[PDB]
Amino acid sequence: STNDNIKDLLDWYSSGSDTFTNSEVLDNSLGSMRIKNTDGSISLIIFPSPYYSPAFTKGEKVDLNTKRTKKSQHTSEGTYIHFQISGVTNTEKLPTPIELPLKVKVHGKDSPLKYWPKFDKKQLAISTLDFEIRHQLTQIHGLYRSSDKTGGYWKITMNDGSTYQSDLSKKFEYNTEKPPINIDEIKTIEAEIN
């Protein structure tokens, strides 16, 4: 059996993420943005961190690799609205898609990857990297599914030696999220399930 916190995490990380490219900024206020996607829907995205406060202005183009916080709504004006959190970056692409170096260890023993995707974007929000990593861990390596796989961490080491890490026993800390990073400057990504 697992505890309730672990169950929330399984529900959160096993679900998918929303992806929209070349969306347009409609409004940008403190802690949020209103964006129009190319399919016609509107996205209301919250940004709770002072360290990652998107500064895009009305009319600019952005990419979304985000998660929904609740069910989308059809409004009176006939508008389809999405409610999401974080995950907004510029639209710059890399010359050729790259494969991020992810090494996974379960109980000290190396655990091979399956369906780890390639990325073609120059920058990704840390929350986006967090969900991609944990999603791989829950679908392929059993994270959160049983009591023997409920903790650990992931750590990203940049070329300059600076690091980013997240504790797997807790939800990603959105309130203190740092700004998006250049993925081609990532030296190593390690994930360990205790």
What's the rounded Cα separation, in Å, for the pair 62 and 68? 17
**First CA to last CA distance, the chain:** 16
Query: Distance between CA atoms of 93 and 65, rounded to whole angstroms?
Result: 14
SS3 content of the chain, % helix, strand, coil (to 5): 15, 45, 40
Q: Residue 10 corresponds to which tokens in the numbers above? A: 């399984």
Q: Which of 40, 58, 88 is the last residue of a domain?
A: 88
44 and 75 co-located in one domain: yes
What is the rounded distance in angstroms from the CA atom of residue 166 to the CA atom of residue 127? Answer: 10
Tokens for 77, please give them.
């004006």
Q: Domain of 180?
A: 1-17+89-194
Q: Which residue shows structure tokens 């205790």?
A: 194
Instruction: Say if residue 114 is in the same domain as residue 69.
Output: no
Give the end of a domain, one of 73, 88, 103.
Answer: 88
Q: Give the span between the Cα atoms of 143 and 166, in whole angstroms.
A: 14
Q: CA 56 to CA 109: how far, in whole Å? A: 44
Run of H or E residues at 174: none
* CA–CA separation, 6 and 146 (whole Å): 9
Q: Are residues 5 and 55 part of one domain?
A: no
User: Residue 56: what residue type?
Assistant: F
Resolution as reported, in Å: 2.0
Shared domain check, 26 and 102: no
Residue 101 CA to residue 31 CA, distance in Å, equals 32
Give how many domains the chain has, as a whole number. 2
